[PDB]
Design a binder for this molecule. Structure first.
Ligand SMILES: COc1ccc2c(c1)N(C(=O)OC(C)C)[C@@H](CSC)C(=S)N2
Ligand SMILES: [Mn+2]
Lengths: 427, 558
């Protein structure tokens, strides 16, 4: 509900104590970044300094929300998040826009600003405590705590939630074709309009949100233009499924046949509809691997038709919303990275692919980081929930770099899976 | 009337309550002793006459044996600081000297007493209460509570530094050019003024802390550098250590092994070359601290080498925020890696090592990255930025690897240093099947409940063979087969396995390993001019594989 210039009493879970998560050492430049940021936040009455009667502390990084001349503070309120939960007691009870993953254009506007206008309950403030590190331990660390709803805390949208609709209502009223579902910090405005127009509806909104006060910085490069490209205009309709496909041929060797058998024998864990023996006899006897063997008449069928058994999903179209959504990622060939997202082993709710080309996007880490943000953002669009990653990167390296090329304003949860030497075969 | 400082509002855990561990008496002896001390204190501040009303008690027990002409007062807050809340941490990240700045002057002021100065939140005093043994059976006994930071309690290191920092504030203010970090009790005022004006400043400061009511050992001079700080020796253009008491003893129990490692593993940071892999393994196969861990062959050797570099105590420098950092790495031995970070040739700031307790099979390269890695994480904390790596490996050797490697990887740019030994590859596996290369279909199964099993092959050239083995593993054997193959095969050959396991070990093209066997294989693959290795479904009866499987112990011939 709305409380006018008054406080809204938040709290924690059953037996739950504030977070005591350790701060990670940053570089000299992320330090000063934050120092400039926070000092000003301090002057604007947003945050405040804290004595030692506060054992609490949640992590923080300095990423470039956008790689502009301007840096940005990114608080990692994950753990703080788990430990609080009294909210779905929200006024609405609608699930996630099952059609949003369907629209033509899904632009992502981030209203994290707003939040800094609501006072946090003096009582709960303490759990928001963060610490700006100090190079090489010379100084205790700098310590502030929030006085307003903090971005990323999975509870500020909920407080604010009422003011949202109250604002959105009009735009939604008139523009009733467009879907507007929000997640964590940003909104997800969708529609089937032809680009040129969509963009404006987004822009009308922006100008609307901004009209009432709720600032939006999410401005695309220019004023009001005409020629098309790839930005944060997610196009849900076009992102499709990169299936597991078999090769085509006029020179298949015994190895060739072999690998094939191996691969289909695997797919039978997903699509048990597969068959192979009539493609397994071709190898009867111990022949060279290089030997070339004509793909037989009765054989040529299997391969051919298994190539259709794959183009059709399995018995797992079922997403239990209260089960964890997991994502895996194999670093294929080069430049390319493939993925999957299941909730249960071998029944992927989706299998995609990521890639780019070494320009400034030179290394593995920035690639992976992007393939992550990518898979995550998709996921929020589809189930409105980020998956748990199983990144194929030594944690150290991931932990020292993961920030460098990050731009989102959420932190999924990851883990470091350590090895895929066959699953790499195009999952 | 007057407490300078302001108090850091305190509290204890919700629902919990103060300690009441009652008075465990002792005769009237040391009672005068304490009574003398707690009265010289009672003055006005440090403590106070507790009324009758006092319910709590955290027992003061006099132990003068630690102090000479003086009878030391040592309380025990065991049951109070149990009941106390928690405070933000009292940072324990020994600023590694290596990331310290060159200074012309450095001074030091004891402040461990201050504790006793800072006032205590009134409402939390009602629990610091300690009781002195009087002489009778009746009611009144000597009741005294604290009114300052009781050394020993929980957040004393806490609320002190806070309090301390908010006190330095102004001096630190009017004196924009003088560094004053602290470490629990040691204050290190530092600057760049001749010892004279320096103690001018260090002069004003002592008076300042003094006006903010604090101690100072004496209106005396002050410093005494080099320093003995957390095992470090700090001169100006230098920093090091010397407490090396290293065992020449007959026997050696884990405890004096852990100290053995624990000691070199410290020397490690500034002596160019310490190794300690071997000594490590030792811990393997034990629990009790004073036990039989029959020392080993190579071990004495490691213990033997560093024993030398220690001969001439070393010296590390300080850092030039202006200059660029640099680290080179060299491959000490079979898996050990030694590095060092400097800013100017030979003027090291610190050094280190690296051994891969990681994995059970690895190769120079991966290791060399974990190293490059370990150093960066370090470097980031110690200096707030990452060094320029110079390493014994040509791009071509590594670029052809981070690429085929299935794991993500990012090295801050490096710089080929041709200082042999060189990190290289010994074999690459021909990424495609060979022609005219005999094709060996291999296997080696065992009974999961036995000691003996057998491995063998069947080729296209018609050759069939089986070898029987003593005390092996079903897995272990599949790697025997691979191994048998490479044995009676030509300089180029194709191998076909059903062991995702043997596949995965070899594929990772390892060079260093502890599995005696895998070290054999990793050997034949270098004598080989070309090796193609591929997999196939198990018990799926695929021409060549269907043959070695029924040619191996199928249950039992029966
Ligand atoms: C002669 O010892 C020193 C020489 C140089 C430095 C220090 C001590 N440093 C320090 O606090 O020492 C710690 C390790 C206890 C700090 C601050 S001293 C003002 C600095 S800037 N470099
Ligand atoms: Mn087998």
């Amino acid at each position: 509900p709305i409380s006018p210039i008054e406080t809204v009493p938040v709290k924690l879970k059953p037996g739950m104590d504030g977070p005591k998560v350790k701060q990670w050492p940053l570089t000299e430049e992320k330090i000063k970044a934050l120092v400039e940021i926070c000092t000003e936040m301090e002057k604007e009455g947003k945050i405040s300094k804290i004595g030692p009667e506060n054992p609490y502390n949640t992590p923080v990084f300095a990423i470039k929300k956008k790689d502009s001349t301007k840096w940005r503070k990114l608080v990692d309120f994950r753990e703080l998040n788990k430990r609080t939960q009294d909210f779905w007691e929200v006024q609405l009870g609608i699930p996630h826009p099952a059609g949003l993953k369907k629209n033509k254009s899904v632009t992502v506007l981030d209203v994290g600003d707003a939040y800094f206008s609501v006072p946090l309950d003096e009582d709960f403030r303490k759990y928001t405590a963060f610490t700006i590190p100090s190079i090489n331990n010379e100084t205790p660390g700098i310590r502030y705590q929030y006085n307003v709803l903090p971005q990323g805390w999975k509870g500020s949208p909920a407080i604010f939630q009422s003011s949202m609709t109250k604002i959105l209502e009009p735009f939604k009223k008139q523009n009733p074709d467009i879907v507007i579902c929000q997640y964590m910090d940003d909104l997800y405005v969708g529609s089937d309009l032809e680009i040129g127009q969509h963009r404006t509806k987004i822009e009308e909104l922006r100008q609307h949100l901004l009209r009432w006060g709720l600032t939006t910085p999410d401005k695309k490069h220019q004023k009001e233009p005409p020629f098309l490209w790839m930005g944060y205009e997610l196009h849900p309709d076009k992102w499709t499924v990169q299936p597991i496909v078999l090769p085509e041929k006029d020179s298949w060797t015994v190895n060739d046949i072999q690998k094939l058998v191996g691969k289909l024998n695997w797919a039978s864990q997903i699509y048990p509809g597969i068959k192979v023996r009539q493609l397994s006899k071709l190898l009867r006897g111990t022949k060279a691997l290089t030997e070339v063997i004509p793909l037989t008449e009765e054989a040529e069928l299997e391969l051919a038709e298994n190539r259709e058994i794959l183009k059709e999903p399995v018995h797992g179209v079922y997403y239990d919303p209260s089960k964890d959504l997991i994502a895996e990622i194999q670093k294929q060939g080069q430049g390319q990275w493939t993925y999957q997202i299941y909730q249960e082993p071998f029944k992927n709710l989706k299998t995609g692919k990521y890639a780019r080309m070494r320009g400034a996007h030179t290394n593995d880490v920035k690639q992976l980081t992007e393939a992550v943000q990518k898979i995550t953002t998709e996921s929020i669009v589809i189930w409105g929930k980020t998956p748990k990653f199983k990144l194929p990167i030594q944690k150290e390296t991931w932990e020292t770099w993961w920030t460098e090329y990050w731009q989102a304003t959420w932190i999924p949860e990851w883990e470091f899976v350590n090895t895929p030497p066959l699953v790499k075969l195009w999952y | 009337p007057i407490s300078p400082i302001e108090t850091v509002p305190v509290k204890l855990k919700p629902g919990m309550d103060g300690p009441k561990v009652k008075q465990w008496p002792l005769t009237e002896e040391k009672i005068k002793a304490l009574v003398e001390i707690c009265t010289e204190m009672e003055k006005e501040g440090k403590i106070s006459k507790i009324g009758p009303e006092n319910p709590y008690n955290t027992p003061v027990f006099a132990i003068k044996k630690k102090d000479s002409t003086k009878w030391r007062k040592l309380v025990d807050f065991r049951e109070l600081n149990k009941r106390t809340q928690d405070f933000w941490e009292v940072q324990l990240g020994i600023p590694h000297p290596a990331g310290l700045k060159k200074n012309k002057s450095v001074t030091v002021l004891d402040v461990g007493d201050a504790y006793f100065s800072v006032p205590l939140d009134e409402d939390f005093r009602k629990y610091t209460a300690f009781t002195i043994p009087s002489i009778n059976n009746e009611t009144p006994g000597i009741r005294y509570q604290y009114n300052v930071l009781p050394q020993g309690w929980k957040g004393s290191p806490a609320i002190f530094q806070s309090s301390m920092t908010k006190i330095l504030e102004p001096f630190k203010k009017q004196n924009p050019d003088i560094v004053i970090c602290q470490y629990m009790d040691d204050l290190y005022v530092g600057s760049d003024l001749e010892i004279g004006q320096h103690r001018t400043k260090i002069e004003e400061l002592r008076q300042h802390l003094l006006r903010w009511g604090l101690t100072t050992p004496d209106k005396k001079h002050q410093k005494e550098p080099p320093f003995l700080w957390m095992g470090y020796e700090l001169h100006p253009d230098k920093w090091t250590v010397q407490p090396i008491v290293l065992p020449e003893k007959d026997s050696w129990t884990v405890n004096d092994i852990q100290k053995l490692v624990g000691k070199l593993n410290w020397a490690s940071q500034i002596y160019p070359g310490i190794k300690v892999r071997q000594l490590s393994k030792l811990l393997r196969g034990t629990k009790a601290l004073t036990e039989v861990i029959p020392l080993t062959e190579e071990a004495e050797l490691e213990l033997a080498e560093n024993r030398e570099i220690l001969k001439e105590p070393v010296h590390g420098v300080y850092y030039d925020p202006s200059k660029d950092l640099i680290a080179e790495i060299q491959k000490q031995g079979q898996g050990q890696w030694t590095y060092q970070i400097y800013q100017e040739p030979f003027k090291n700031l610190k050094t280190g090592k690296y051994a891969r307790m990681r994995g059970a099979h690895t190769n120079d390269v991966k290791q060399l990255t974990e190293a490059v890695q370990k150093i960066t994480t370090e470097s980031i904390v110690i200096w707030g930025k990452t060094p320029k790596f110079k390493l014994p490996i040509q791009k071509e050797t590594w670029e052809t690897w981070w690429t085929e490697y299935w794991q993500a990887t990012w090295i801050p740019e490096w710089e080929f240093v041709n200082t042999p030994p060189l990190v290289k590859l010994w074999y690459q596996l021909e990424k495609e099947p060979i022609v005219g290369a005999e094709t060996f279909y291999v296997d080696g199964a065992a009974n999961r409940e036995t000691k003996l099993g057998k491995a063998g092959y069947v080729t296209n050239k018609g050759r069939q063979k089986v070898v029987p083995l003593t005390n092996t593993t079903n897995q272990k054997t599949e790697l025997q087969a691979i191994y048998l193959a490479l044995q009676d095969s030509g300089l180029e050959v194709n191998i076909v396995t059903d062991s995702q396991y043997a596949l995965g070990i070899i594929q990772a093209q390892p060079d260093k390993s502890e599995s005696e066997l895998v070290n054999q294989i990793i050997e034949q693959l270098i004598k080989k001019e070309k090796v193609y290795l591929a997999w196939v479904p198990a018990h799926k009866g695929i021409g060549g594989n269907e043959q070695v499987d029924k040619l191996v112990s199928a249950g039992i011939r029966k």
